[PDB]
Amino acid sequence: SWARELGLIRKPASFMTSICDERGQELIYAGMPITEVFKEEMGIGGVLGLLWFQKRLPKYSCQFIEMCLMVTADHGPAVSGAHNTIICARAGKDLVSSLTSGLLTIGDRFGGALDAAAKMFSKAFDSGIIPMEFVNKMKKEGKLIMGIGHRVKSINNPDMRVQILKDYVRQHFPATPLLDYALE
Amino acid sequence: SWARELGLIRKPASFMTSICDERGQELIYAGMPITEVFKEEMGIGGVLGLLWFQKRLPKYSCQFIEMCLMVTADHGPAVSGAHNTIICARAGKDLVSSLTSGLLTIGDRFGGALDAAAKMFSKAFDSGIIPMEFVNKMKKEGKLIMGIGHRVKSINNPDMRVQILKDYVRQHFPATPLLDYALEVEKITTSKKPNLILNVDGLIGVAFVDMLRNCGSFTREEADEYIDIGALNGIFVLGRSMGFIGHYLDQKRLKQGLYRHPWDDISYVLPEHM
Amino acid sequence: SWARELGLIRKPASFMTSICDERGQELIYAGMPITEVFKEEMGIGGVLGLLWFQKRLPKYSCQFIEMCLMVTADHGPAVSGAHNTIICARAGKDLVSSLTSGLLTIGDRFGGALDAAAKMFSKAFDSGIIPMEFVNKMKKEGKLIMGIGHRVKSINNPDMRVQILKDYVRQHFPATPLLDYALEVEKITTSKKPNLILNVDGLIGVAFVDMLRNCGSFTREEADEYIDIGALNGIFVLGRSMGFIGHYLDQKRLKQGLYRHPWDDISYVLPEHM
Amino acid sequence: GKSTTLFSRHTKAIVWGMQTRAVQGMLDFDYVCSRDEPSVAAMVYPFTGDHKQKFYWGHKEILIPVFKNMADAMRKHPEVDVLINFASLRSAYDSTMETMNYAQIRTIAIIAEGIPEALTRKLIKKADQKGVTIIGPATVGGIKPGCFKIGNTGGM
Ligand SMILES: CC(C)(COP(=O)(O)OP(=O)(O)OC[C@H]1O[C@@H](n2cnc3c(N)ncnc32)[C@H](O)[C@@H]1OP(=O)(O)O)[C@@H](O)C(=O)NCCC(=O)NCCS
C-alpha cells in the first residue's frame, strides 16, 4: 500500500466492472450520479437502464420496463418456482434460501419463454420470411412457436395483461416491427 | 510479480486456509499427501477426517462416518428437499441447480435434527442431570426432545438403520457415554409411547458427539467447536446429496415434464379488495 | 383418504421415482434393502451405484467410484467454487448457503471437464477415427481437447493422482478401450509439449465411460444415457462438496471477518456520463 | 382387398395426437370388456420427444410410449393394425397419406371435422388402391362391444 500510494509498483487488475463506481463522494451508476438519478426522476426502469445496459433510456422505455416488472410478478403459487419457494418457506429457512430455491427453476420450461420467444421471432424476422411461411416452417420441425398460446384467455376473451402491455407498445412507442410480425 | 519474486515488497494475505495445499508436486490434504491418502487405505471417511477436522481419525471412526453417509442418503421423494430437487429436475434445469434447490431446505425442520439432537443431548449430559429429570425438564417447557420418535418403527419393531448404526457404535467404539444417556432417555420415553425410539437423526448426532469427544484426536474444546460450528449439518448434507443427485438423474431418465401442482390442493384465501 | 382406503376412487400420480422406497418396514434402495446394503459390504460407491444407476455394481467399480470421490475432493481455496464458499463463509451465513454458493459455479469452465472430456473422447472413439486423426481434427477447429494438459506436472513428473487412478484402472478393471484411446492421444500430445498429459478431470471421464460401457450391468444405451443426462457432473459435485464443506468449517474455525476485495484489483472502466 | 373383421380382442392401435382422455376411455372400455391387453400400443405426437405417458388399467397404472415420428411407432410395434387419426382438419390429410404407405395399418379412423372434399377424395382413392378401410372423416369413431372402441365413441 505504501509503494502503490507513492506509485512505484504496478499491478494488473481483474474485475473490469463497467458499472457502479462506489468510490468517491457519490455513488455513480453507469455514468450518472445518484443525485442525478433521483433528480432526473427516473424510476426502477431508469436504474435498470443504467445498471444493465449502461444507457440513459427514454422515459417511455423506463416505464415499459417497470410495466414488464409489474406483470412478470407473481402468477400464483401453483407454478414451479413459487411452489419451490413455498416448500422452502414451510421448512422454516430464511428469505434468501426460499427466494433462491424458487429462483433456481427459472430455466427453459419455467420462465424461459421470455428469451426464447424473442430469439425465435428475431431469427425469423431477420431471416426475411413472411409470417405465413414462418408458421409452416415451425410446423415441419416439431418445436411449437414459443410465446404463442394460452389455456383459457383466447380471443373475444383477451388476456388483459397482454392487452395493457400491447396498448402501451402501440401508443408510447415508435417503430415497432417485430411486434407487428408477432401480431401477424 | 517481479518485486515479490526477488522479495522486496510485502503484502498481507487473506484466506488463511488450514486445508488442502494445492501448490507443489503433490496434492496435500490436511497434512497428508494424496499418495499417503491412498496408501494408508483411508476411504471417504478418512478424507472427511482430513478435510473437515484436519485429523487422521482411527479406522473405526472413518468407517462410522462412511456408514452415516450411507444411511443419511436418500429417504424417498416425499420429503422436502427431494421434492424440491424433483420439481427442479422436471423444469429441465441441470444437476447443480436441481441439487442446489433441494439442498437449500436443509435447515431446522428438514435435516436439522442431526445438529439439534446433539446440542440438546450434550447440553443435558454436560449439565449433569439424570435422564429421568431431563425428560421432565423438556416436558415443562414445550419443545419435544429432538432425535426421539418414529412414525411407524416403534419397539418390538426396530428401525433397522438405527440398529445397524447402534450395533456399530456398541462394537467398534470405546467409551460411549452420550449414547448410553440417549438410550436411557429412550428407555424412559418408550414407556410413555410405543413409538418414541431414537431417530437415525438423533442417534447419528449423539454417536457423532461420542465419536468426537470419546476417541483420540480431540480434546474437549475442539470437540465442542466442531459441534457448534456445524460439522453435523455437513454429514446430513453430504449424505443427502447422493440421494438428491440420484433423484435428479431419475427424473431425467424417466423424462418427465414440467410440474404444475393442481389448483384443488391450494385453497386461495385472498383478501376481499385490497 | 377413506374413499381411497377402501379403494373406490382412482387418482393419477405424479413423481414416478424409480429410486428409494421409503414406505414399509425397511428402507429399500434401488431394489435392495438397507440391511442388505450393509450386509453385502458395499460402501459409498455401492450406494451411488444403487441410487444413481439403480444397479448393483461389481466390487471394483464401487471402489473406483470411491477413489474418484476421493480425488475430486478439495483442490485448494484458489479455485472458483472454493473461493465462493469462503466468501460466503466469511459473510457468516451457514453451511448450506456457503456450500451452495460454491456449488453453483460447477458449470463448463470450472468442474465441467469431467463430462465434456468424456463426451468428446466418446464421440471421437465411437466415430471410428485413430487418435492421430482426432488430434488434428481438433486442431483445425480451435476447441482444445478437454481433459488434456497440466500447468506443472508434465512427464518425467507425473500428476500422482492421475497415476493412482490410472494404476487402478489398469489392474482391477477388464477391457478398457477408451482409456487406451485417451492414452494414445496422450502419447501424441506429449510429443508436442511436455505438459500435455491427461488431467484428472479427463481420466475420470474416460475411465468412467469405460466403467459404464465395459463392465456388466449396462448395455450401451443405458451407458450412453447416463453419460448424456449428466451422471459425471454428479461425481465432481459430490466429491467437491466434501472440500467445500471443509472450507466452510475451516473459515468458521479460523474466525475470519467479512471480505471486502480491495479497490486496487478492480479497475473501474465506467462510461463518461450516461 | 378390404378386410371383413376390422376389430377383434387382439387389435392394437396407434393414436395420432395428444389425446390422453380418449386413450384412457379406450383402456377403461378394454378393462370393462374383460380384455387381456390394452388397445393402444403407442401415441404419435410430433411436437415433443419420445417419452412415456401414464395411463390406468383398472386399478393398475401402465405406461404407453409417446413417439415423435410415425416410423419409430411402426418399427417398435408390428402388431398394430389400426391407426386413429385425431389430427386437425389441416393436418389430417398429410398424416393419413403418410400412414397409408405402411402395410401393417389395415384400417384408419379420421376424426377431424372439415377436411376439404378434394383432399378426402384423394384419401379415398389411395385407400382403395392400398386396400385399407378408412372409417370416414368427421366421425366420432366406431364401437365394437367386447373388442374395441375408437377414441371417444360411446362417451364416458
Ligand atoms: C382432435 C381435434 C380436437 C383437432 O385438434 P385441434 O383442436 O386442432 O388441436 P390440435 O392440437 O390438434 O391442433 C391445434 C393447431 O394449432 C397449432 N398449435 C398448437 N400449439 C401451438 C403453439 N404453441 N404455437 C403455434 N401453433 C400451435 C398446431 O399446429 C395445430 O395445427 P396443425 O394442424 O398445423 O398442427 C378434432 O379432431 C376434434 O374435434 N376431435 C373430435 C373429432 C370430432 O368430433 N369431429 C367429428 C365430428 S364432431
Tab-separated table of N, CA and C in Angstrom, chain B residues 82-213:
chain	number	residue	atom	x	y	z
B	82	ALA	N	-35.952	-33.520	-1.384
B	82	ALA	CA	-36.107	-34.397	-2.536
B	82	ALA	C	-37.227	-33.919	-3.431
B	83	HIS	N	-38.293	-33.401	-2.826
B	83	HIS	CA	-39.375	-32.787	-3.577
B	83	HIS	C	-38.887	-31.595	-4.382
B	84	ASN	N	-38.108	-30.704	-3.757
B	84	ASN	CA	-37.596	-29.529	-4.466
B	84	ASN	C	-36.646	-29.904	-5.599
B	85	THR	N	-35.816	-30.929	-5.388
B	85	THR	CA	-34.919	-31.413	-6.436
B	85	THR	C	-35.697	-31.974	-7.614
B	86	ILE	N	-36.805	-32.658	-7.343
B	86	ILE	CA	-37.598	-33.233	-8.424
B	86	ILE	C	-38.365	-32.153	-9.182
B	87	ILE	N	-38.901	-31.154	-8.473
B	87	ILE	CA	-39.579	-30.032	-9.132
B	87	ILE	C	-38.600	-29.245	-9.989
B	88	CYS	N	-37.342	-29.215	-9.567
B	88	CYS	CA	-36.306	-28.518	-10.314
B	88	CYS	C	-35.845	-29.329	-11.526
B	89	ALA	N	-35.740	-30.644	-11.360
B	89	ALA	CA	-35.313	-31.523	-12.441
B	89	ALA	C	-36.370	-31.643	-13.519
B	90	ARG	N	-37.640	-31.560	-13.147
B	90	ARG	CA	-38.721	-31.595	-14.116
B	90	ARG	C	-38.918	-30.273	-14.830
B	91	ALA	N	-38.386	-29.181	-14.294
B	91	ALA	CA	-38.303	-27.919	-15.009
B	91	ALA	C	-37.104	-27.864	-15.941
B	92	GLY	N	-36.346	-28.947	-16.038
B	92	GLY	CA	-35.321	-29.084	-17.045
B	92	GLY	C	-34.075	-28.276	-16.810
B	93	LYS	N	-33.577	-28.228	-15.577
B	93	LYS	CA	-32.542	-27.238	-15.334
B	93	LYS	C	-31.123	-27.698	-15.640
B	94	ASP	N	-30.512	-28.414	-14.697
B	94	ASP	CA	-29.187	-29.033	-14.732
B	94	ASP	C	-28.988	-29.637	-13.353
B	95	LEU	N	-27.873	-30.346	-13.183
B	95	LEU	CA	-27.663	-31.110	-11.960
B	95	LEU	C	-27.407	-30.201	-10.777
B	96	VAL	N	-26.640	-29.138	-10.988
B	96	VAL	CA	-26.220	-28.272	-9.899
B	96	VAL	C	-27.386	-27.439	-9.394
B	97	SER	N	-28.216	-26.910	-10.293
B	97	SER	CA	-29.382	-26.145	-9.872
B	97	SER	C	-30.434	-27.008	-9.203
B	98	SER	N	-30.590	-28.258	-9.635
B	98	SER	CA	-31.556	-29.164	-9.025
B	98	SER	C	-31.111	-29.596	-7.638
B	99	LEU	N	-29.877	-30.107	-7.543
B	99	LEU	CA	-29.277	-30.465	-6.262
B	99	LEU	C	-29.268	-29.295	-5.305
B	100	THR	N	-28.951	-28.116	-5.806
B	100	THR	CA	-28.862	-26.913	-5.007
B	100	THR	C	-30.225	-26.444	-4.510
B	101	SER	N	-31.243	-26.479	-5.372
B	101	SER	CA	-32.601	-26.130	-4.982
B	101	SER	C	-33.188	-27.116	-3.992
B	102	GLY	N	-32.716	-28.354	-3.987
B	102	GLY	CA	-33.126	-29.264	-2.938
B	102	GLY	C	-32.290	-29.176	-1.682
B	103	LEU	N	-31.022	-28.801	-1.828
B	103	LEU	CA	-30.129	-28.668	-0.687
B	103	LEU	C	-30.467	-27.449	0.134
B	104	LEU	N	-31.043	-26.430	-0.478
B	104	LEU	CA	-31.405	-25.241	0.282
B	104	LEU	C	-32.724	-25.369	0.999
B	105	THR	N	-32.998	-26.509	1.608
B	105	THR	CA	-34.110	-26.715	2.511
B	105	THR	C	-33.634	-27.405	3.762
B	106	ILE	N	-32.386	-27.862	3.783
B	106	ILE	CA	-31.796	-28.489	4.948
B	106	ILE	C	-31.510	-27.381	5.941
B	107	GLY	N	-32.441	-27.202	6.862
B	107	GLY	CA	-32.440	-26.107	7.799
B	107	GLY	C	-32.663	-26.605	9.197
B	108	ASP	N	-33.765	-26.172	9.804
B	108	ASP	CA	-34.165	-26.638	11.120
B	108	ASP	C	-35.252	-27.704	11.111
B	109	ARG	N	-36.239	-27.608	10.224
B	109	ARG	CA	-37.339	-28.560	10.206
B	109	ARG	C	-37.029	-29.805	9.400
B	110	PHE	N	-36.292	-29.666	8.307
B	110	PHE	CA	-35.861	-30.784	7.484
B	110	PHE	C	-34.346	-30.849	7.560
B	111	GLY	N	-33.819	-31.939	8.101
B	111	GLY	CA	-32.390	-32.138	8.124
B	111	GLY	C	-31.630	-31.436	9.221
B	112	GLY	N	-32.310	-30.843	10.188
B	112	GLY	CA	-31.605	-30.158	11.247
B	112	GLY	C	-31.756	-30.816	12.593
B	113	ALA	N	-32.194	-32.069	12.606
B	113	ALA	CA	-32.236	-32.843	13.832
B	113	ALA	C	-30.899	-33.480	14.158
B	114	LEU	N	-29.992	-33.555	13.182
B	114	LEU	CA	-28.634	-34.043	13.417
B	114	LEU	C	-27.897	-33.158	14.403
B	115	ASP	N	-27.921	-31.853	14.160
B	115	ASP	CA	-27.152	-30.921	14.965
B	115	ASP	C	-27.904	-30.540	16.230
B	116	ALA	N	-29.226	-30.392	16.140
B	116	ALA	CA	-30.025	-30.041	17.306
B	116	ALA	C	-30.153	-31.199	18.282
B	117	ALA	N	-30.284	-32.423	17.780
B	117	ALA	CA	-30.357	-33.609	18.615
B	117	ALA	C	-29.022	-33.987	19.223
B	118	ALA	N	-27.948	-33.309	18.854
B	118	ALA	CA	-26.666	-33.450	19.516
B	118	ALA	C	-26.374	-32.310	20.467
B	119	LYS	N	-26.750	-31.080	20.099
B	119	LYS	CA	-26.627	-29.958	21.022
B	119	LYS	C	-27.510	-30.138	22.248
B	120	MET	N	-28.715	-30.685	22.068
B	120	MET	CA	-29.639	-30.851	23.185
B	120	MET	C	-29.156	-31.919	24.156
B	121	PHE	N	-28.770	-33.082	23.634
B	121	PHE	CA	-28.274	-34.151	24.490
B	121	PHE	C	-26.916	-33.817	25.092
B	122	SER	N	-26.104	-32.999	24.416
B	122	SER	CA	-24.839	-32.585	25.002
B	122	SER	C	-25.036	-31.537	26.084
B	123	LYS	N	-25.986	-30.619	25.904
B	123	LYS	CA	-26.276	-29.642	26.940
B	123	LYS	C	-26.996	-30.264	28.120
B	124	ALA	N	-27.637	-31.410	27.924
B	124	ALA	CA	-28.229	-32.139	29.032
B	124	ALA	C	-27.244	-33.041	29.750
B	125	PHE	N	-26.331	-33.671	29.026
B	125	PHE	CA	-25.373	-34.581	29.631
B	125	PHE	C	-24.244	-33.848	30.330
B	126	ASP	N	-23.838	-32.689	29.813
B	126	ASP	CA	-22.777	-31.912	30.436
B	126	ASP	C	-23.284	-30.982	31.527
B	127	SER	N	-24.597	-30.803	31.657
B	127	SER	CA	-25.119	-30.067	32.801
B	127	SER	C	-25.157	-30.947	34.037
B	128	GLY	N	-25.187	-32.259	33.844
B	128	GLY	CA	-25.086	-33.187	34.947
B	128	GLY	C	-26.419	-33.524	35.571
B	129	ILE	N	-27.409	-33.854	34.747
B	129	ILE	CA	-28.698	-34.310	35.245
B	129	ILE	C	-28.960	-35.705	34.704
B	130	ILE	N	-29.660	-36.505	35.502
B	130	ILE	CA	-30.013	-37.875	35.146
B	130	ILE	C	-31.097	-37.807	34.075
B	131	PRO	N	-31.242	-38.833	33.219
B	131	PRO	CA	-32.227	-38.762	32.122
B	131	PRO	C	-33.667	-38.591	32.564
B	132	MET	N	-34.042	-39.164	33.707
B	132	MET	CA	-35.396	-39.059	34.232
B	132	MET	C	-35.752	-37.650	34.676
B	133	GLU	N	-34.762	-36.787	34.904
B	133	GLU	CA	-35.009	-35.371	35.107
B	133	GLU	C	-34.917	-34.566	33.826
B	134	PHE	N	-34.176	-35.047	32.825
B	134	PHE	CA	-34.075	-34.344	31.551
B	134	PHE	C	-35.371	-34.447	30.758
B	135	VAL	N	-36.028	-35.612	30.801
B	135	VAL	CA	-37.293	-35.777	30.082
B	135	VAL	C	-38.370	-34.880	30.680
B	136	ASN	N	-38.414	-34.788	32.008
B	136	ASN	CA	-39.398	-33.931	32.659
B	136	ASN	C	-39.028	-32.458	32.576
B	137	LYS	N	-37.737	-32.140	32.438
B	137	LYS	CA	-37.347	-30.760	32.179
B	137	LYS	C	-37.803	-30.317	30.797
B	138	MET	N	-37.700	-31.204	29.808
B	138	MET	CA	-38.217	-30.900	28.482
B	138	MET	C	-39.707	-31.165	28.356
B	139	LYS	N	-40.370	-31.433	29.476
B	139	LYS	CA	-41.808	-31.666	29.476
B	139	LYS	C	-42.558	-30.453	30.032
B	140	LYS	N	-41.839	-29.589	30.744
B	140	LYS	CA	-42.421	-28.394	31.344
B	140	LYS	C	-42.166	-27.134	30.527
B	141	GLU	N	-41.583	-27.263	29.336
B	141	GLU	CA	-41.239	-26.101	28.522
B	141	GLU	C	-41.840	-26.148	27.126
B	142	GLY	N	-42.688	-27.126	26.820
B	142	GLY	CA	-42.895	-27.443	25.424
B	142	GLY	C	-41.636	-28.116	24.909
B	143	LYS	N	-41.299	-27.828	23.642
B	143	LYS	CA	-40.061	-28.211	22.944
B	143	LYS	C	-39.651	-29.676	23.123
B	144	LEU	N	-40.356	-30.581	22.432
B	144	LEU	CA	-40.056	-32.013	22.338
B	144	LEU	C	-38.577	-32.342	22.145
B	145	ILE	N	-38.145	-33.474	22.697
B	145	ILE	CA	-36.755	-33.902	22.599
B	145	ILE	C	-36.430	-34.226	21.147
B	146	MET	N	-35.520	-33.452	20.559
B	146	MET	CA	-35.088	-33.676	19.186
B	146	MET	C	-34.305	-34.977	19.089
B	147	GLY	N	-34.628	-35.788	18.089
B	147	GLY	CA	-33.988	-37.074	17.931
B	147	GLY	C	-34.679	-38.230	18.613
B	148	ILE	N	-35.940	-38.070	19.008
B	148	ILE	CA	-36.735	-39.117	19.642
B	148	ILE	C	-38.041	-39.261	18.877
B	149	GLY	N	-38.325	-40.472	18.410
B	149	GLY	CA	-39.630	-40.728	17.836
B	149	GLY	C	-39.582	-41.161	16.387
B	150	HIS	N	-40.391	-42.160	16.060
B	150	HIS	CA	-40.629	-42.566	14.686
B	150	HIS	C	-42.131	-42.689	14.481
B	151	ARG	N	-42.569	-42.594	13.227
B	151	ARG	CA	-43.994	-42.730	12.957
B	151	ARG	C	-44.438	-44.189	12.998
B	152	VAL	N	-43.586	-45.115	12.555
B	152	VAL	CA	-44.006	-46.492	12.315
B	152	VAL	C	-43.189	-47.477	13.142
B	153	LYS	N	-41.873	-47.504	12.927
B	153	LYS	CA	-40.994	-48.477	13.572
B	153	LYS	C	-40.841	-48.096	15.037
B	154	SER	N	-41.344	-48.940	15.939
B	154	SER	CA	-41.539	-48.465	17.300
B	154	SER	C	-40.681	-49.131	18.367
B	155	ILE	N	-41.040	-50.364	18.713
B	155	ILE	CA	-40.359	-51.231	19.669
B	155	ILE	C	-41.079	-52.565	19.502
B	156	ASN	N	-40.331	-53.673	19.618
B	156	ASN	CA	-40.619	-54.982	19.006
B	156	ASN	C	-40.758	-54.882	17.485
B	157	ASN	N	-40.214	-53.814	16.899
B	157	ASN	CA	-40.244	-53.421	15.500
B	157	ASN	C	-39.206	-52.320	15.310
B	158	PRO	N	-37.914	-52.621	15.356
B	158	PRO	CA	-36.910	-51.557	15.347
B	158	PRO	C	-36.702	-50.993	13.945
B	159	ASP	N	-35.975	-49.872	13.889
B	159	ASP	CA	-35.891	-49.079	12.666
B	159	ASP	C	-34.956	-49.675	11.623
B	160	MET	N	-34.026	-50.537	12.043
B	160	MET	CA	-33.138	-51.344	11.201
B	160	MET	C	-32.127	-50.544	10.386
B	161	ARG	N	-32.099	-49.220	10.529
B	161	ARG	CA	-30.916	-48.439	10.207
B	161	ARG	C	-30.419	-47.644	11.395
B	162	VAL	N	-31.272	-47.422	12.394
B	162	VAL	CA	-30.826	-47.096	13.738
B	162	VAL	C	-30.101	-48.287	14.348
B	163	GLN	N	-30.501	-49.502	13.979
B	163	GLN	CA	-29.933	-50.705	14.570
B	163	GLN	C	-28.556	-51.047	14.027
B	164	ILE	N	-28.317	-50.828	12.733
B	164	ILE	CA	-27.001	-51.097	12.156
B	164	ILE	C	-25.978	-50.122	12.715
B	165	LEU	N	-26.365	-48.848	12.800
B	165	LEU	CA	-25.526	-47.842	13.436
B	165	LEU	C	-25.298	-48.157	14.902
B	166	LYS	N	-26.352	-48.563	15.611
B	166	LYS	CA	-26.266	-48.780	17.051
B	166	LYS	C	-25.391	-49.979	17.392
B	167	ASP	N	-25.484	-51.056	16.617
B	167	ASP	CA	-24.542	-52.154	16.778
B	167	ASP	C	-23.189	-51.898	16.137
B	168	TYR	N	-23.019	-50.825	15.363
B	168	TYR	CA	-21.649	-50.419	15.068
B	168	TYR	C	-21.025	-49.678	16.244
B	169	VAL	N	-21.770	-48.756	16.858
B	169	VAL	CA	-21.262	-47.983	17.987
B	169	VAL	C	-21.121	-48.844	19.246
B	170	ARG	N	-21.817	-49.973	19.335
B	170	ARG	CA	-21.612	-50.818	20.504
B	170	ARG	C	-20.360	-51.675	20.388
B	171	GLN	N	-19.944	-52.023	19.173
B	171	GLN	CA	-18.869	-52.989	18.975
B	171	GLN	C	-17.502	-52.345	18.773
B	172	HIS	N	-17.371	-51.456	17.790
B	172	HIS	CA	-16.074	-50.948	17.349
B	172	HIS	C	-15.728	-49.612	17.977
B	173	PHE	N	-16.128	-49.354	19.201
B	173	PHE	CA	-16.229	-47.954	19.570
B	173	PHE	C	-16.127	-47.813	21.083
B	174	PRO	N	-14.962	-47.475	21.626
B	174	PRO	CA	-14.804	-47.461	23.083
B	174	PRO	C	-15.423	-46.230	23.719
B	175	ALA	N	-15.921	-46.421	24.948
B	175	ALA	CA	-16.285	-45.344	25.868
B	175	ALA	C	-17.342	-44.400	25.310
B	176	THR	N	-18.581	-44.859	25.182
B	176	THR	CA	-19.641	-44.073	24.554
B	176	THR	C	-20.720	-43.587	25.529
B	177	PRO	N	-20.464	-42.516	26.293
B	177	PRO	CA	-21.388	-42.172	27.384
B	177	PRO	C	-22.638	-41.440	26.934
B	178	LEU	N	-22.550	-40.583	25.913
B	178	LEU	CA	-23.729	-39.831	25.500
B	178	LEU	C	-24.727	-40.717	24.772
B	179	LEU	N	-24.260	-41.763	24.086
B	179	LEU	CA	-25.205	-42.718	23.521
B	179	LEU	C	-25.885	-43.527	24.617
B	180	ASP	N	-25.164	-43.852	25.695
B	180	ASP	CA	-25.790	-44.528	26.830
B	180	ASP	C	-26.825	-43.638	27.505
B	181	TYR	N	-26.531	-42.342	27.605
B	181	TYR	CA	-27.502	-41.377	28.111
B	181	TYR	C	-28.727	-41.296	27.207
B	182	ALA	N	-28.515	-41.292	25.890
B	182	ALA	CA	-29.630	-41.229	24.953
B	182	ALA	C	-30.446	-42.511	24.964
B	183	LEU	N	-29.808	-43.648	25.225
B	183	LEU	CA	-30.538	-44.901	25.344
B	183	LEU	C	-31.296	-44.991	26.661
B	184	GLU	N	-30.823	-44.316	27.709
B	184	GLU	CA	-31.615	-44.235	28.934
B	184	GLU	C	-32.820	-43.313	28.762
B	185	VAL	N	-32.649	-42.198	28.040
B	185	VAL	CA	-33.796	-41.370	27.651
B	185	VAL	C	-34.747	-42.162	26.760
B	186	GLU	N	-34.209	-43.053	25.924
B	186	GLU	CA	-35.043	-43.923	25.102
B	186	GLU	C	-35.828	-44.911	25.953
B	187	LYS	N	-35.187	-45.498	26.971
B	187	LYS	CA	-35.878	-46.402	27.890
B	187	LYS	C	-36.985	-45.687	28.649
B	188	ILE	N	-36.770	-44.417	28.981
B	188	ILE	CA	-37.793	-43.654	29.687
B	188	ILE	C	-38.933	-43.263	28.747
B	189	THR	N	-38.619	-42.894	27.506
B	189	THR	CA	-39.658	-42.427	26.594
B	189	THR	C	-40.438	-43.565	25.951
B	190	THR	N	-39.840	-44.748	25.779
B	190	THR	CA	-40.611	-45.875	25.254
B	190	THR	C	-41.586	-46.454	26.266
B	191	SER	N	-41.533	-46.022	27.522
B	191	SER	CA	-42.577	-46.375	28.467
B	191	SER	C	-43.796	-45.477	28.309
B	192	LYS	N	-43.601	-44.253	27.816
B	192	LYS	CA	-44.725	-43.355	27.581
B	192	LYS	C	-45.525	-43.799	26.369
B	193	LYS	N	-44.854	-43.962	25.241
B	193	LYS	CA	-45.462	-44.371	23.992
B	193	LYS	C	-44.680	-45.541	23.429
B	194	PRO	N	-45.302	-46.372	22.597
B	194	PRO	CA	-44.513	-47.383	21.887
B	194	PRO	C	-43.554	-46.809	20.856
B	195	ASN	N	-43.967	-45.755	20.155
B	195	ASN	CA	-43.171	-45.171	19.076
B	195	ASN	C	-42.350	-43.936	19.418
B	196	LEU	N	-41.582	-44.011	20.495
B	196	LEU	CA	-40.721	-42.913	20.895
B	196	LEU	C	-39.336	-43.521	20.959
B	197	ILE	N	-38.779	-43.867	19.801
B	197	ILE	CA	-37.489	-44.525	19.797
B	197	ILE	C	-36.475	-43.477	19.358
B	198	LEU	N	-35.186	-43.800	19.444
B	198	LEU	CA	-34.180	-42.945	18.827
B	198	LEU	C	-34.348	-42.908	17.320
B	199	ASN	N	-34.348	-41.698	16.772
B	199	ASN	CA	-34.279	-41.498	15.337
B	199	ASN	C	-32.927	-41.934	14.797
B	200	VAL	N	-32.800	-41.951	13.475
B	200	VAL	CA	-31.463	-42.006	12.917
B	200	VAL	C	-30.821	-40.625	13.012
B	201	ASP	N	-31.632	-39.566	12.945
B	201	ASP	CA	-31.161	-38.196	13.049
B	201	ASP	C	-30.808	-37.798	14.473
B	202	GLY	N	-31.122	-38.626	15.459
B	202	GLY	CA	-30.715	-38.366	16.820
B	202	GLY	C	-29.578	-39.268	17.231
B	203	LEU	N	-29.590	-40.502	16.726
B	203	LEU	CA	-28.517	-41.422	17.067
B	203	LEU	C	-27.225	-41.058	16.354
B	204	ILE	N	-27.296	-40.546	15.122
B	204	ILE	CA	-26.071	-40.079	14.478
B	204	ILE	C	-25.526	-38.848	15.188
B	205	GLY	N	-26.405	-37.978	15.690
B	205	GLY	CA	-25.949	-36.820	16.445
B	205	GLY	C	-25.236	-37.191	17.733
B	206	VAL	N	-25.853	-38.053	18.541
B	206	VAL	CA	-25.218	-38.391	19.811
B	206	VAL	C	-24.018	-39.323	19.614
B	207	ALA	N	-24.046	-40.215	18.620
B	207	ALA	CA	-22.901	-41.068	18.366
B	207	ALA	C	-21.766	-40.319	17.696
B	208	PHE	N	-22.052	-39.203	17.035
B	208	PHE	CA	-21.002	-38.370	16.478
B	208	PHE	C	-20.370	-37.486	17.538
B	209	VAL	N	-21.144	-37.035	18.530
B	209	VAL	CA	-20.522	-36.369	19.675
B	209	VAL	C	-19.653	-37.348	20.458
B	210	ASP	N	-20.101	-38.600	20.608
B	210	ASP	CA	-19.234	-39.617	21.207
B	210	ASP	C	-18.007	-39.903	20.352
B	211	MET	N	-18.157	-39.866	19.028
B	211	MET	CA	-17.019	-40.050	18.137
B	211	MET	C	-16.013	-38.921	18.286
B	212	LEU	N	-16.488	-37.692	18.457
B	212	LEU	CA	-15.568	-36.568	18.574
B	212	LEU	C	-14.895	-36.545	19.938
B	213	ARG	N	-15.673	-36.552	21.014
B	213	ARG	CA	-15.102	-36.337	22.336
B	213	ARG	C	-14.661	-37.621	23.022
